[PDB]
Amino acid sequence: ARKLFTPITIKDMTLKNRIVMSPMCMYSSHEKDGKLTPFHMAHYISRAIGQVGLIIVEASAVNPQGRITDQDLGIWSDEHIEGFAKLTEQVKEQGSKIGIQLAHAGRKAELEGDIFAPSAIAFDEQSATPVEMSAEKVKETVQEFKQAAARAKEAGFDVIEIHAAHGYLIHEFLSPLSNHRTDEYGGSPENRYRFLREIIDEVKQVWDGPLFVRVSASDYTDKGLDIADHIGFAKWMKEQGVDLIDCSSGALVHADINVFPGYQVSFAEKIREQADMATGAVGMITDGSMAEEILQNGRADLIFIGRELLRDPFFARTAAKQLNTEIPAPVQYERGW
Amino acid sequence: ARKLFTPITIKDMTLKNRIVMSPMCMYSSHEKDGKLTPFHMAHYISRAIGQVGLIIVEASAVNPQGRITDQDLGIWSDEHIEGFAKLTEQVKEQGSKIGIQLAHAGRKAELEGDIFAPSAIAFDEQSATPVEMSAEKVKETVQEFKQAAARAKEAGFDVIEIHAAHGYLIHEFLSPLSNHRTDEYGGSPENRYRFLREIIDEVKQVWDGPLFVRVSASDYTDKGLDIADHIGFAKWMKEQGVDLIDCSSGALVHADINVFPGYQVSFAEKIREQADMATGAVGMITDGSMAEEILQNGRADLIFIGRELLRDPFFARTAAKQLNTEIPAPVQYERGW
Amino acid sequence: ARKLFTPITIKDMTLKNRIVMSPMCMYSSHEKDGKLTPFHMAHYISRAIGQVGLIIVEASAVNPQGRITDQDLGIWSDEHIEGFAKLTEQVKEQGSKIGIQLAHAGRKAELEGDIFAPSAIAFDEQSATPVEMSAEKVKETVQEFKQAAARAKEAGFDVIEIHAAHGYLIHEFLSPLSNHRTDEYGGSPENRYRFLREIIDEVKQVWDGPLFVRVSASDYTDKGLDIADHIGFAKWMKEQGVDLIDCSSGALVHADINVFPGYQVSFAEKIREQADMATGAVGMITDGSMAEEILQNGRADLIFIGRELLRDPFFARTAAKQLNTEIPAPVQYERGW
Amino acid sequence: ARKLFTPITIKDMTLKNRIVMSPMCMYSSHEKDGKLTPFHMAHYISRAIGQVGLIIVEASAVNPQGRITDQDLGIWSDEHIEGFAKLTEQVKEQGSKIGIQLAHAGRKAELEGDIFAPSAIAFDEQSATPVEMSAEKVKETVQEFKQAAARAKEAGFDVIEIHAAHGYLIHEFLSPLSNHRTDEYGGSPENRYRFLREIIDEVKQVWDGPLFVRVSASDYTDKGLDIADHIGFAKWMKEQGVDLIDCSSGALVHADINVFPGYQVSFAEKIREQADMATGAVGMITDGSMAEEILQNGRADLIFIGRELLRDPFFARTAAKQLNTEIPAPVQYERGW
Ligand SMILES: Cc1cc2nc3c(=O)[nH]c(=O)nc-3n(C[C@H](O)[C@H](O)[C@H](O)COP(=O)(O)O)c2cc1C
Ligand SMILES: Cc1cc2nc3c(=O)[nH]c(=O)nc-3n(C[C@H](O)[C@H](O)[C@H](O)COP(=O)(O)O)c2cc1C
Ligand SMILES: Cc1cc2nc3c(=O)[nH]c(=O)nc-3n(C[C@H](O)[C@H](O)[C@H](O)COP(=O)(O)O)c2cc1C
Ligand SMILES: Cc1cc2nc3c(=O)[nH]c(=O)nc-3n(C[C@H](O)[C@H](O)[C@H](O)COP(=O)(O)O)c2cc1C
Structure with missing residues (x-):
């Protein structure tokens, strides 16, 4: 069969195909709770x-x-918990x-009231300047990721992903552009990685199954993080027991990014090869042929699909057709698929 | 713009486009209730x-x-009622x-215990012979359609469709191949139409909104009903206030049917022209070009889509693209559509 | 199989499928000869x-x-002759x-020097007023169609089509908007059809193979020709031995025309049914599904494709795939089709 | 604009886009001349x-x-020459x-009479055993490639490609599996590359423009050539002035090859990076998105398309649409493209 429709087992979880619906905010919790x-x-x-x-x-x-x-x-x-359990x-x-992406928006939170970050540096000229988290607040936030992971386990999720990308809180600690701290959470790569290191260790105290971490593999900015920095972080994550690194990029600050089909695939391939880490x-x-090429040429282990699943929720069927292969249809749709 | 994406008003109901998801059984009420x-x-x-x-x-x-x-x-x-209201x-x-199709399977009911029909004639060799409904039972069934319509109104439906097709109960009364009765519900075309006539009049006593009737416009069988018979029934339905006839065909008995793209469109166009009745x-x-042609050439008023909506739930977007036109996207998917 | 890919015989000519490449000017005879x-x-x-x-x-x-x-x-x-024979x-x-469309642009000829028409009436504000053809000139033109048909036969064409559409010479004689003559070629519908009648009879003196006539089935203008007029002309053409009427429309004068997929299909179906004449x-x-529907619902006998064959020269393969059917590939492309 | 539709200049030749129609035999010279x-x-x-x-x-x-x-x-x-000049x-x-691929089938020639190769080893059990070329015959064949290149220049070709792939003559000399010679044309990689080295040098005596060489970058066989061998040959070709290496693979002997979308792209990428050589x-x-990804991620400089151009001769238009970009249409097809 096609690699896109071949199973893969991570920890005790077996995925029936390699298609993953990428996390995408819906901004639909209208009761604001x-x-x-x-x-x-x-x-x-x-x-x-x-x-x-x-x-x-x-x-x-x-x-x-x-x-x-x-x-x-x-x-x-x-x-x-009740809603997620359903x-x-x-x-x-x-x-x-099913998995859930645990997150904290940091200085990119668009809320009223004080917002937080490793350092008091605004995202851009249209944003509020965040409050520098005290060391106590940093440690409380690590505990919140741990407590959230425990809730995710109780709700029945199969995978937990830590959102360490897109300019949000953890990414702000990782990058020298946004982290100017003078305590144990800033400075050297070891100190800048410490927040994420503590989150991973604490989450592992309440969760043993599949653990993914999404990163922005480059800041595309002078003096910012690049793929070499992320290969380094990836090796530390492998030592800590992270199962897969979901490879995104950008959004810490505004930057010029050349976007094209597969523009982030090189990050997934380099981390996979150099850090011996499974990657997404x-x-x-947007199509089955590219997905198959990425997997067959050993550039990644899972194919994350975002916008194409917003256009075509049944992308798996479309991709199977494109690859001239067959996949099981949901039982209710057998006189249609 | 494109007619497929132009609003249409039926009674006090305005549809934003002319695409209808055809009723399709899901066989998913697992508790059998x-x-x-x-x-x-x-x-x-x-x-x-x-x-x-x-x-x-x-x-x-x-x-x-x-x-x-x-x-x-x-x-x-x-x-x-509670579930439908949600x-x-x-x-x-x-x-x-949203609409609901009110139905009664008659002699095609796949259930244990006596099943019912206008006459004791089985659907085929592998089906049970049904019990000929007494006139009392026919009248009780008319009241059940009325009571069901009252529940649909309470539950908030915008449209009610009467299922008078596919060889089910009402179709069995309409056709001389299945209705051999000699009382007021059989014999002449008027008597064979009486059951449907009473259902429409009683439903109108509790429902004043859009009322659709789905018919099988041909039995594709010698001595069975054909499009001329259905043009006659359509004229009677128009007099009774039916708003649209959803034009399907077949399934009263096994028959050879030549299926191809748009194979039932001629029934919709003939009833529309000759009975001056809106049709589906x-x-x-399966594509926007055909849908637009049907509407623009005056062959029907609404386009019902079945299996293509099982393959592509977002057919409306696909059809808009095929017709090189723009339609509003659900707000949550503006970044993908 | 699919009707679109089923052979059809016209005279002693058998077509392997029902797809026709509609005549389309290339404006590529650079030496102006x-x-x-x-x-x-x-x-x-x-x-x-x-x-x-x-x-x-x-x-x-x-x-x-x-x-x-x-x-x-x-x-x-x-x-x-030499070039066409190759x-x-x-x-x-x-x-x-292969067929050829015999033509004369009449008052729409974009050439220097006198241009000709049934009456001295210009196409529009930016066009030269044509010279009213003398009866002698009309007869000379009929002989030119005859002589051209003899050349087409010598060159090996299988079909000859007379261009009586798109506001060109023959169409100008047919319509009362452009033909104000008071001799044998004007006045009554019979006299307005006389030029075409003579062309058909003379062509048949030198050509006994399939003969098609392309018409503009409506002028979309008050006091101009409409489909009823063309059903009448079609009955006369049938009596004269024309094999198929290729049904186009418009272009005699500027007019508002609602264009959409299949917008001229109603003309082909009405002439086919009412004049008992094969139609194109x-x-x-632009797709196989629509083509198959037109044929299966008896709206036409052949499907003419213009612009889609400019975008996709191998439309036959694309349509076969859309209809989930197999067709022979040119031997050289068996490894790709 | 998209990289697929960005120009590239090789020597004095500028290509308007990066799409190349891959050489594909048509087996259509029916007069056998x-x-x-x-x-x-x-x-x-x-x-x-x-x-x-x-x-x-x-x-x-x-x-x-x-x-x-x-x-x-x-x-x-x-x-x-005359035919090619037209x-x-x-x-x-x-x-x-336009370019031409200069070739010699070697032991894979399916002709009557003696066939030739570096060594008397048959391609497979269904093939004739070739005659080992004498050193004089090897040198005569080098001269035939030179003479053919002179004819290609006279005929007006813009590019000449040497066919050193798919198990044909030059590939047979390159690989230890097919070349067991004990003279200057066999043994070490230098001796096995000598035939190709002499062909390139001699062709350069009569042709200065773009020179491409197509290789089979792997034999997929134990003791055969692999990508490391070809990176070595590529460095020698760069020294000799070859402008681009067209990266194919296989066919020297039967082998198990895992084929999938982009299965030969790694060869193009490795030769490009390691030998500092432009690659095809x-x-x-089969689509514009993959073509763009290959170019944007620096895996190759030109995208060769074979079978998709047999299915869709107007692939360039299709790819431009897929990439949501515009390209000039042939003038004759402007009311269609
Ligand atoms: C509407 C929308 C919401 C998104 N929200 C998230 C999110 O909650 N978490 C995240 O990691 N990425 C988020 N993303 C990024 C996507 O997961 C994905 O990485 C990105 O769109 C690139 O993939 P694509 O080209 O397949 O869409 C979002 C993207 C869109 C379009
Ligand atoms: C799975 C399935 C269930 C169906 N159930 C119903 C039904 O409940 N009522 C009905 O009137 N037609 C039913 N039909 C017929 C469809 O509504 C539709 O008329 C038919 O499939 C023709 O349209 P299509 O070619 O767009 O699918 C069903 C069809 C399918 C495939
Ligand atoms: C570039 C071009 C040239 C045409 N030239 C002719 C012609 O020589 N004769 C004719 O009868 N119609 C001519 N037409 C009309 C086409 O044959 C065809 O009837 C029309 O484009 C409608 O079909 P389509 O939507 O498949 O293109 C031409 C159309 C185009 C786009
Ligand atoms: C019918 C056919 C003939 C071919 N003839 C040649 C040839 O003359 N020279 C060559 O180098 N490759 C030849 N090939 C290989 C193609 O150029 C191309 O490298 C191969 O099909 C892989 O590309 P694709 O998947 O885009 O078709 C041929 C392929 C086909 C299908």
């Missing part, structure tokens, strides 16, 4: 009916002031595995 | 996110012994109008 | 490699002053049948 | 109308007994550049 709504249920469950191997739920805030917007999903309260059960019933490729992958 | 399940919610709401103008819910039985299978949806009990609210919130075209319509 | 050039050869032969059943060569003038532009192909001279041999060797459908037909 | 036929003219010229930047004519034999089949094109005689002129007139990628590249 981080809870799920019927829209979210239909949105996610339809891609499970659509046969996506693994569906990663959008950035879910570990603290309310870590939301990107006040309509974001949250996982900062035990009240969020979602995981329904997605798995349709045949898919993402970024303008 | 006719109730909705989470799968049904995701299945239907996803096409509302997908911008279908009107979603018609699958054949819903007006009597438990009128189900096609024991996993069918039902609307024979007030217990069914479904109509959620589909409408996503921007579509359905049958192997 | 009406002769073929290497571009024309590649242009036409490539669609024969592409499996089009019948290729109709673009409007070819029967008189030099009847060209639309000075870069048009011509068939007014015996010097044109083209017909080469297209037929690749497996297709043309106009925004 | 190696001459062109009308089919070849339409076949090649149509892809020039289709806007392919560079069209490489199929393997053309430098000696009649070096043909793969007796219906192959040839360039072993001055009689072949083809190059017509392809360039449509806006494309080929092998199951």
Whole structure:
């Protein structure tokens, strides 16, 4: 069969194909309480009916002031568990595995009131200047990622992804452009990686299954992080037991980025080869042929699809047709697929 | 713009486009009680996110012994109202109008215990011989359609469609191949149409909104009904206030049917022209170009899509692209559509 | 199989499928002598490699002053025979049948010097007023169509089509908007049809093969011709032995025309049914599904494709795939098709 | 603009886009004299109308007994010049550049009579055992490549490609699996490369423009050539002035090859990076998105397309649409493209 439709086992989890629905915020928690709504249920469950191997739920805030917007999903309260338990059960019933992206927006939070970051440096001229987190607050935030992971386990998720990309809180600590701290969380690469190191270790105290980390593999900026820095972080993550690195890029600060089909694939390939770490490729992958090429040429292990799944929730069927292969159809749609 | 994406008003109901999700059984009421399940919610709401103008819910039985299978949806009990009320609210919130198809499978019911029909004639060699309904039983069934319509109104549906096609109960009364009665419900075309006439009049006593009737416009069998018979029934339905005839065909008995793209369109165009009745075209319509041609050449008023919406829930977007035109995207997907 | 790919016989000519390359001017006779050039050869032969059943060569003038532009192909001279003989041999060797459209642009000729028409009425504000043809000149033109048909027979064409559409000479005689004559060629519908009647009878004196006539089935103008007029002309053409009417529309004068997929199909279906004449459908037909529907619903006998064959010379292969059916590939491309 | 539609200059030749029609035998020289036929003219010229930047004519034999089949094109005689001169002129007139692949089938020639190779080893059990070329015959063959290059220059080609792949004569000398010679043309990599070295040097005596060499970058066989061997040959070719290496693979002997979209791209990327040589990628590249990714990620400089151009001669237009960009249309097709 085609590699895109070949299984892969990570820890005790077996994915039936290599297609992953990339985490994508829906800004649909209209009651501003981080809870799920019927829209979210239909949105996610339809891609499970659509046969996506693994569906990663959008950035879910570990603290309310870590939301990107006040309509974001949250996982900062035990009240969020009931809704997620229904979602995981329904997605798995349709045949898919499900994960959740744990997040904190840091200086990119678009909320009223103080927002937080490793250093008091604004994202851009249109943004509020964040408050530098005290060491106590940094440690409390590590505990919030741990507590959120425990809630995700209770809710029944199969995979937990740590959002260490797109200019959000963890990425701000990793990069010298945004982290000018003079304590244990700033300076050397070891100190800049410390926040993420502590989050991974603490999450591992309450969660043993698949652990993914999404990174922005380059800042595309002078004096910022580049792929060499991320290969270094990837080797430390492998030592800590991270199972896969989801390779994105950018958004710490505004930058000129040449976007084209597969523009982030080189990051996934280099981290996979140099850090001996399984990787997820993402970024303008819109068809089965490219997905198959990426996997067959050993550039990544999982293919993350974002916008094409917004256009075609049944991308798995489309890709199977493009690759002239067959895949099981949801039972209810057998006189159509 | 494109006619397919131009609004149309029927009664006090305005549809934002002319794409209709044809009713399609999901055989997913697992507890055998006719109730909705989470799968049904995701299945239907996803096409509302997908911008279908009107979603018609699958054949819903007006009597438990009128189900096609024991996993069918039902609307024979007030217990069914709560679930439908949630479904109509959620589909409408996503921007579509919603209808329900009221049904009774007659001699094609695949259930244990006596099944019913206008005459004791089995569908085929592998089916049970049905019990000839007494006139009392026929009248009780008319009241069940009325009671089901009252529940549909309470549950918030925008449109009610009467299932008078596909060899089910009403179609069995209409055709001389299946109706050999010698009382007021058989013999002449007027008497064979009487059951449907009474259902329409009684439904109108509790429902003043858009009323559609789905017919099988031909039996494709010698001595059976053909399009001329249906043009006659359509004129009678127009006098009774039916708003649109959804034009399907076949399934009263096994028959050789030549299927091809648009194979039932001639029925919709002839009834539209000769009975001066709005019509719905359905049958192997899978792309926007054909849909637009049907509407622009005056062959039908609404385009019903079945299997293509099982392969592509977002057919509206695909058709808009094929017709090189722009349509609003659900707000959550503006970055992908 | 699919009707689009089923053979059809007209006279002693069997077409392997029902796809026709509609005549389309290439404005490529650079020496202004009406002769073929290497571009024309590649242009036409490539669609024969592409499996089009019948290729109709673009409007070819029967008189030099009847060209639309000075870069048009011509068939007014015996010097044109040699080039056409090579083209017909080469297209037929690749497996297709070939036709030629005999033409005279009348008042729409974009040439210096006097241009001709049934009456001295200009096409529009930016066009020269034509010279009213004397009866002698009309008769000379009928002989030029006859002489051109004899050359087409000598050159090896399988089909001859008379261009009586698009506001050109014959169409100008047919319509009361452009023909104000008071002699035998004007006044009544019979007199307005006389020029075409004489062309058909004279062509039949030198050609006994398939004879097609392309018409503009409506002028889309008050007091102009409409489909009822053309159904009448079609009955007369049937009596004269015309084999098929290629149904186009418009262009006699500027008019508002609503264009959409299949916008001229109603003309082909009405002439086919009411005049009992085989018809060719043309106009925004771009996919196999629509083509198959037109044929299966009895709206036309042949499907003419214009612009889609300019975008996709191998439309036959694309349509076969869309219809999930197999067709023979040119032997040279068996490893790709 | 997109890199696929960005120009590139090689020597004095500027290609308007990066799409190349890969050389593909047509087995259509039916008179068995190696001459062109009308089919070849339409076949090649149509892809020039289709806007392919560079069209490489199929393997053309430098000696009649070096043909793969007796219906192959040839360039072993001055009689072949006239036909090629017409083809190059017509392809360039449509806006494309044109090249020719100089070839000798060696032990894979399917001809009657003795066939030749570096050693008397048959291709497989179904093939004739070739005659080991004497050193004099090897030197005569080098002169035949030189003489053929002179004919190609006279005929007006813009690029000459040497066919050193697919198990044919030059590849047989390069590989230890097929070359067991004990003279100056066998043994060490220097001796095995000598035949190709002499061909390149001699061709350079009569041809200064763009010179491409197509190689099979792996034999996929134990003790055969692999990418490391070809990076070595590529460095020697760069020293000799070869402008680009067209990277194919296989066919020296039967082997198990895992084929998938982009399966030969790694060879193009490694030779480009390690030998600082421009490269052509080929092998199951069927869409614009993959073509763009290959170019943007620096894996190759030109994208060679084979079978997709047999299915879609106007692939350039299709790819431009896929990449949401615009490209000039052939003038004759402007109301269609
Ligand atoms: C509407 C929208 C919301 C997104 N939200 C998130 C998010 O919550 N977390 C994340 O890591 N990436 C997010 N992304 C980035 C996507 O997951 C994905 O990495 C990006 O769109 C590149 O892939 P694509 O070209 O397949 O869309 C979002 C993208 C879109 C279009
Ligand atoms: C799985 C399935 C279930 C269906 N159930 C129903 C139904 O409940 N009511 C009905 O009137 N037609 C039913 N149909 C028929 C469809 O509504 C539709 O008329 C038919 O499939 C022709 O349209 P299409 O070619 O667009 O699918 C069903 C079809 C399918 C494939
Ligand atoms: C470039 C071009 C040239 C044409 N020249 C002719 C012609 O010589 N004769 C004719 O009858 N129609 C001519 N037409 C009209 C076409 O044959 C065809 O009827 C029209 O384009 C409608 O079909 P389509 O939508 O498949 O293109 C031409 C159309 C185009 C685009
Ligand atoms: C019918 C056919 C003939 C071919 N003849 C040649 C040839 O003359 N020279 C050559 O180098 N490759 C030849 N090939 C290989 C192609 O140029 C190309 O490298 C191969 O098909 C891989 O590319 P694709 O997947 O885009 O077709 C041929 C392929 C086909 C299908």
